[PDB]
């Protein structure tokens, strides 16, 4: 029942109630302060939490991240991405049952109606896959705009189905629009992960057998970017939400949102200092690039502005890494360069001093190039697994009593009020 | 050189920067709150001033709206939109040759590629316009994402001109789509609003010639909604461009924020109130279920929760409301109807006293419905009007030495961590 | 389908006529099973030639190319029963 008081000058103490949540760092409520004639200022909205949430936590010093309260770790080392999505969607584990039903549900939105595989025939087989992916999320929109009543939580719920069941299908679609291949319909035989690679890599030409030691990397990387709690995307989701818009047209900003170099890039800028390095000669050379703090080359891929010591997410990734190189077996003057920077970054002190661990961007971008996937689909990937989050984050907010359209404001610093003249009068 | 400060308990007090603009709420700076173990809590961030502008001031309680400075009445009754358009882009009023420059080029850019042209075939011809026009304007983002380097501002200065010059002639493609009429070519002897008004309602069958009291009515609307400061569609705009997104995915998400009915149905709820009351009979008793506070009737299109007293954006559309209801002399029930709210809203008493009169979305559902516009269309007209606003928004974003990704906070109020065991263990 | 063989077509030559109802009645049920999926957006199936025409028809209009469709014998007797129950009605208004 605590409160902050803020003083001013010669004005009275305002008082702002203080929150607490179940856990991490208490909250100054605000939602008061412009009656007392002030707004905060906050680019980016660093300080400023926009909304209560139950599905995801982070705390980065400490390596936390849960979902549902479930720590990603174990989540990973024992649940399949279709399970860790039955949670995100309904909070709790399921059981055996409930699980076997969602899978037989989500296996019957996966085909893409026809008149939707048409639609591709709109872009040039150049486009941006993400351009694509995101027409194509907003040709959902116009699909069922009209059968969709957002009040109605049972729509919203056949709604989180539907981008779930579809998004591997039209992923994979893009990929083979851009690459002139014809479409790979869904095969029930198959687990999400392994439907997906199926889809993506399979032609008319043989039977294409989806190796399970990759089935099982692409489901831990659906899993290891599942959510992340607020963020550039899902809060643009959830903004562009707040009005009552069409949930699946707040999926296509939100994918506009990821497409944006700075949110869903960072897996190619790893790929692309890895080229640049060239061969392992050349390590120690671009190693002394990176620490010089004039020299724009840094380390892509290594330590992490959120998890500061330790991403938990790493560890797994850092598996699943080594599994797929041994079971591929390539030879790569790119992966040998990889390698050994790994093998640097856990004894060399310097990296093992300024926190420098090869991180989850890092394994991620490896196992997507040594699997076969295109720099230019990197980030579609992320966009399939993030989905879900996207849908859990919308739900929630529209489930909430506190939700509102919002309305930011700004620190105006443009011309003070000027007479127009008309421009005969000039 | 202020400061407020913050105190809690037994810490120390937090000082906080309180930054003045030009104009307007003075703000206090939370850039640091983060680093004393707080975050401010704002649903809908009515309190939070994400940022630093110039372009739009409002200050609702007196009745101001300016643009960079200029006055929105003196803005309408003495300029034509695209010199607003230019007023919003650089930042002062055009010279006459800097404007018949700038009309020549919107004018060259305003055919649209064949290739664009194709798209439509995409959609079904009922699908929602919106939702058409989401998907036409991501298509554009397809289509220069490859020569286009946002951080070139020649490159967001041609941008700027694309969607200008583009965005009613994809308008009236929509109209034409989901009526099954074809595309009309744009004429460079019309002028903006009335080459929209050609490509809209010309056929192949005659000369279609634009009536000058509604394409002035026009060009009035697209003035009066080119800008409104921050808000759900532009922030959006903002947030999803925070990431380095392309600027037409951006702009295709603040139609997506627009098009939820919350931000951009206005229009509409209003001309459905009238159609509810029916007759001039029904007037006084439909009155009384408004006032009833239990009674889930009230009455859309009065009054205004920023302009509290006065929008001076109601002066202009009442008079350009009543120029063309006199020119197209229509005679319908429902115009009577809205003519007899008017009447009363100006003399009776409790109107004039709970400061409801007849807004800017009252006049502009009336000149809308009267200039044959249907009701599927109404969005899409703001969209077209408030694109200028959206860009100039991004390029100033994008100009920011402030700017960054977004990353809005949040309270978590889930479940504490908690073991997951595998589902064979349970 | 009479855009399609109209030139080719004497209906003088009762040879023309035979090979006319051989066409209507092998390709009715694939147009019939296309208006179906037309109408719901998922693809064609085309006809399998170890199949029987009752069995043939529910798998060209229920088959999906996402796993084997197995047509229910009891069911494909149906579908046989009730095209031999409207196989014919003497004259009547679309006979006539």
Same mark, same amino acid.
């Given at each position: 029942?605590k409160?902050?008081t803020? !003083?001013?000058e010669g004005?009275a103490?305002?008082?702002?109630?203080?929150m607490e949540?179940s856990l #991490?760092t208490?909250?100054? +409520? $605000?939602?008061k @302060?412009?009656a007392?004639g002030?707004?905060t200022? *906050?680019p980016?909205f660093? =300080?400023?939490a926009?909304?209560?949430?139950?599905?995801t936590?982070?705390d980065g010093?400490?390596g936390?991240?849960l !979902?549902?309260g479930?720590?990603?770790?174990?989540?990973?080392?024992?649940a399949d991405?279709?399970?860790?999505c039955?949670?995100?969607?309904y909070?709790?584990?399921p059981?055996?049952?409930?699980?076997?039903?969602?899978?037989?549900?989500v296996?019957r939105?996966?085909m893409?109606?026809?008149?939707?595989?048409?639609?591709?025939? #709109?872009?040039?087989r +150049?486009?941006?896959?993400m351009?694509v992916?995101?027409?194509?999320?907003?040709?959902?929109? =116009?699909?069922?705009?009209?059968?969709?009543?957002?009040?109605?939580?049972?729509?919203?719920?056949?709604? =989180?189905?539907?981008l779930?069941s579809?998004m591997p299908?039209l992923a994979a679609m893009?990929?083979?629009?851009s690459?002139?291949?014809?479409?790979?319909?869904?095969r029930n035989?198959?687990?999400?992960?392994?439907?997906?690679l199926h889809?993506?890599?399979?032609?008319?030409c043989?039977e294409?057998?989806?190796?399970?030691v990759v089935?099982?990397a692409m489901d831990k990387?659906?899993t @290891?970017? =599942? +959510?992340?709690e607020?963020?550039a995307?899902? /809060?643009?989701?959830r903004?562009?939400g707040?009005?009552?818009?069409?949930?699946?047209?707040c999926?296509a900003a939100?994918?506009?949102?990821?497409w944006?170099?700075?949110?869903?890039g960072?897996n190619?800028?790893?790929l692309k200092?890895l080229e640049?390095?060239?061969s392992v000669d050349?390590?120690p050379?671009?190693?002394?690039?990176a620490? *010089?703090? +004039?020299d724009?080359?840094?380390?892509?891929?290594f330590?992490?502005?959120?998890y500061?010591?330790?991403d938990?997410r790493?560890?797994?990734?850092?598996?699943?890494? !080594?599994?797929?190189?041994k079971?591929?077996?390539i030879?790569?003057?790119?992966?040998?360069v990889?390698m050994?920077?790994?093998?640097?970054a856990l004894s060399?002190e310097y990296f093992?001093?300024?926190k420098?661990?090869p991180? $989850?961007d890092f394994?991620?971008?490896i196992?997507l190039?040594?699997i076969g996937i295109?720099v230019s689909?990197?980030?579609?990937i992320?966009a399939?697994?993030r989905?879900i989050?996207w849908?859990? !984050?919308?739900?929630?907010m529209? /489930? *909430?009593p506190l939700?509102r359209i919002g309305?930011?404001?700004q620190?105006?610093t443009g011309?003070?009020?000027?007479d127009f003249?008309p421009?005969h009068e000039?």
């Open positions: 029942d409160k902050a803020l !003083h001013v004005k103490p305002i008082e702002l109630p203080i949540g #991490g208490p909250v100054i +409520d $605000v939602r @302060l412009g007392n002030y707004f200022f *906050d980016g660093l =300080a400023t926009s909304c209560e949430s139950q599905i936590y982070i010093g400490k936390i991240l !979902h549902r479930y720590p990603i770790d174990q989540l990973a080392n024992n991405y279709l399970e860790v039955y949670i995100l969607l909070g709790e584990a059981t055996r049952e409930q699980y076997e039903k969602f899978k037989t549900t296996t939105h996966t893409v109606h026809e008149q939707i595989a048409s639609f591709f025939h #709109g872009f040039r +150049d486009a941006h896959p351009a992916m995101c027409g194509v999320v907003g040709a959902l929109a =116009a699909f069922y705009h009209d059968s969709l009543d957002i009040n109605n939580d049972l729509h919203r719920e056949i709604t =989180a189905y539907r779930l579809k299908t893009c990929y083979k629009y690459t002139g291949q014809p479409f790979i319909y869904p035989d198959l687990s999400y992960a392994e439907n997906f889809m993506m890599f399979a032609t008319p043989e294409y057998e989806v190796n399970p089935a099982r990387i659906f @290891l970017h =599942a +959510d992340h607020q963020n995307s899902t /809060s643009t989701v903004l562009a707040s009005s009552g818009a069409n949930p699946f047209a999926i939100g994918i506009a949102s990821l944006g170099p700075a949110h869903g960072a190619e800028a790893c200092m640049e390095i060239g050349n390590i050379e671009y190693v002394d690039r620490k *010089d703090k +004039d724009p080359f840094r380390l892509m891929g330590g992490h502005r959120v500061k010591n330790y938990p790493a560890t797994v990734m850092r598996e699943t890494c !080594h599994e797929v190189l079971e591929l077996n030879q790569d003057p790119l992966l040998d990889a050994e920077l790994e093998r640097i060399d093992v001093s300024k420098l661990y991180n $989850v394994y991620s971008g196992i190039k040594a295109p689909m990197f980030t579609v992320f399939i697994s989905t989050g849908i859990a !984050h919308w739900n929630e529209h /489930s *909430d939700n309305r930011p404001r620190l105006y011309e003070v009020q000027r003249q421009m000039r």
